[PDB]
Design a protein around this ligand. Structure first.
Ligand SMILES: C[C@@H]1CN(CC(=O)N2CCc3ccccc32)CC[NH2+]1
Ligand SMILES: [Zn+2]
Length: 106
């Protein structure tokens, strides 16, 4: 499924922080559910899989060292909600960091 890059959310029922928070329930996983919800994510109830309400972008297998906002930017750089919340300065930082990470290792 293609990422939504319009200013209009793919899932408006999940636009409110509160609505997103309810989707998690008891959350056993290594990443913080409030932190996920703040970054626009809601739970699908499929292990630790989340989707952004806005871009629809999905993400799984959360390691303790993976930040919701950073991962949002890594995989869904066109997300208008991300751009609104964080800014383009932050998005660029994050991408430069990841590209330089995936080059320093090799
Ligand atoms: C939290 C991170 C996420 N990583 C990428 C990931 O989960 N992606 C990348 C694109 C995609 C589409 C659909 C479902 C998942 C994913 C994996 C490691 N943990
Ligand atoms: Zn998004």
């Amino acid at each position: 499924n293609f990422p939504n890059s319009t200013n209009l959310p793919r899932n408006p029922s999940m636009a409110d922080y509160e609505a997103r928070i309810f989707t998690f329930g008891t959350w056993i996983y290594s990443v913080n559910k409030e932190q996920l919800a703040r970054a626009g994510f809601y739970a699908l109830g499929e292990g630790d899989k989340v989707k952004c309400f806005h871009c629809g972008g999905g993400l799984t297998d959360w390691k303790p060292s993976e930040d919701p906002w950073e991962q949002h930017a890594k995989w869904y750089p066109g997300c208008k909600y991300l751009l609104e919340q964080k800014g383009q300065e932050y998005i660029n930082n994050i991408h430069l960091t990841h590209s330089l990470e995936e080059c320093l290792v090799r």
